[PDB]
């Protein structure tokens with residue numbers, strides 16, 4: 001059996017993102033997988049990295065250093081419960097899918113705040129244990145991104161550059177760094193200008209791809225993959 | 230000179246190395262006689278989430294909420310939440326916007342990502358058409374002043390992290406150039422926590438020193454080739 005966590009960042013259940021999340025739940029549930037969804041906006045998930053993320057008393061209450069404080073908090077079981085709740089889902093998961101609209105070539109700030117606050121030192125990475133040896137190694141991660149821009153805008157010589165170029169900080173700098181093997185991203189280009197069909201083809205392709213997600217090999221998550229020819 | 234600067238600052242700790250870079254900027258720019266404003270996001274408890282609370286008028290489509298459509302509308306009607314319009318005023322007046330922050334996950338801290346997502350709305354920062362070189366903030370300068378955990382050597386093409394310019398792309402091109410800014414070369418202060426106390430003073434005064442001649446700089450060519458090479 002396998003466990004999947006979907007971390008989902010869209011305000012509107014009727015959205016194209018909402019339908020992609022909902023077919024993932026339906027298809028992975030149909031296969032017998034254990035599925036959990038973190039619907040960040042419904043949870044009013046806190047995005048800011050602050051001293052509230054530590055309960056009881058700080059390791060150095062003269063000069064606040066978020067990284068050191070959350071590292072010590074993790075080790076002393078002193079993190080806020082919204083964070084540890086997410087860490088439990090991630091620890092149990094075999095695959096983590098992030099489902100979100102591209103905001104400013106990146107994730108919406110609420111999902112950025114999940115990455116900043118959930119993936120702390122001791123949990124997701126340490127000295128050592130990063131990139132290849134990151135603490136989440138053995139787990140799979142997958143970005144399912146929707147865009148306002150069309151596929152042609154996202155080419156090396158198009159106005160937006162190649163899609164892979166905006167993937168680097170998320171796939172390499174975040175998911176690889178924590179040890180994830182990164183599945184190929186699912187990019188649903190410009191759903192809002194596509195037809196009622198086309199949109200169906202995109203959703204159905206996603207549902208279709210999920211049918212054989214466990215047979216996939218991860219991308220080689222390298223500078224060459226993102227930037228080379 | 231007769232110029233206005235906005236510093237958008239994202240760090241929790243006033244005694245931090247970011248706190249020092251922000252204050253040296255304020256001291257040097259104020260010394261030159263520039264007009265200076267700082268948006269200290271954590272101290273303001275700045276709201277990062279893009280939600281329907283950012284619009285206070287009748288929604289264009291209250292059956293199916295589309296944040297970009299509703300905020301674009303709300304900007305035209307003046308029904309945006311006032312935290313957002315308070316920032317727009319600072320940006321509209323500024324000739325240079327400096328972002329001061331620690332690198333978090335190859336990007337800005339979520340509180341600052343939220344400032345970008347909610348403040349740079351359609352109608353204000355760009356339109357369709359009216360983006361990249363035609364973006365609505367054309368004529369303004371922006372500059373990322375980023376600190377890292379990683380050393381410079383780490384952030385080279387054959388270092389573990391890849392070249393520093395790679396992680397600049399979403400921010401410089403995808404956000405600031407998109408809105409029309411000309412982008413000045415980034416100030417990257419590498420690995421201050423590892424550096425010696427004297428190498429730290431050196432990085433602070435190197436930023437101070439650069440600001441002395443900031444108005445004479447040309448912007449970078451904010452292209453794929455600048456960021457990625459051939």
Ligand SMILES: Cc1cc2nc3c(=O)[nH]c(=O)nc-3n(C[C@H](O)[C@H](O)[C@H](O)COP(=O)(O)OP(=O)(O)OC[C@H]3O[C@@H](n4cnc5c(N)ncnc54)[C@H](O)[C@@H]3O)c2cc1C
Pocket residue numbers: 010014015016017018019100101102103104105106146147148149150191192196199200203279293295296297346347403
């Ligand atoms: C702050 C901000 C920053 C942005 N930055 C970027 C950026 O850097 N680059 C970029 O390219 N874009 C950017 N965008 C645009 C954004 O990425 C797109 O708006 C978003 O990806 C569209 O996805 P959605 O789910 O919201 O679309 P929706 O509008 O919800 O989807 C399109 C249509 O499909 C309908 N639908 C729902 N379910 C289904 C289904 N079952 N089958 C068929 N249709 C269905 C919807 O109701 C809708 O009519 C930005 C947007 C914002 C607000």
Ligand SMILES: Cc1cc2nc3c(=O)[nH]c(=O)nc-3n(C[C@H](O)[C@H](O)[C@H](O)COP(=O)(O)OP(=O)(O)OC[C@H]3O[C@@H](n4cnc5c(N)ncnc54)[C@H](O)[C@@H]3O)c2cc1C
Pocket residue numbers: 049065066067116117173240244245246247248249330331332333334335336376377378379380421422426429430433
């Ligand atoms: C969630 C998260 C994600 C991160 N992701 C990344 C990443 O992707 N890539 C990466 O490289 N790093 C990353 N980091 C590390 C982060 O970028 C660095 O910790 C940050 O850049 C260091 O800057 P700071 O101001 O907090 O340093 P500080 O810890 O405040 O400063 C270091 C030292 O400089 C001293 N100092 C303060 N003022 C002065 C002064 N006037 N003169 C001389 N010294 C002074 C301080 O007192 C301190 O001792 C991440 C950190 C976190 C918390």
Ligand SMILES: COc1cc(OC)c2c(c(C)cc(=O)n2C)c1OC
Pocket residue numbers: 121125126127129130378379380383420423
């Ligand atoms: C650039 O130096 C580095 C590089 C790292 O990873 C590449 C680090 C750390 C620290 C302190 C903790 C940690 O978990 N990692 C993962 C570091 O600081 C010494």
Ligand SMILES: COc1cc(OC)c2c(c(C)cc(=O)n2C)c1OC
Pocket residue numbers: 104105148149150153160297351357403404407
């Ligand atoms: C801020 O909103 C943005 C930002 C963008 O880029 C950073 C966008 C778009 C759309 C619709 C198409 C597109 O290609 N890009 C590149 C967008 O929607 C208006």
Ligand SMILES: COc1cc(OC)c2c(c(C)cc(=O)n2C)c1OC
Pocket residue numbers: 067121173174177334335377378379380383390
């Ligand atoms: C999540 O925290 C992170 C994440 C990183 O990369 C994504 C880091 C580092 C540090 C300290 C050095 C570094 O080179 N990288 C590359 C870090 O600090 C522990």
Ligand SMILES: [Zn+2]
Pocket residue numbers: 171172173176177220221222223
């Ligand atoms: Zn990688």
Ligand SMILES: [Zn+2]
Pocket residue numbers: 401402403406407450451452453
């Ligand atoms: Zn550019």
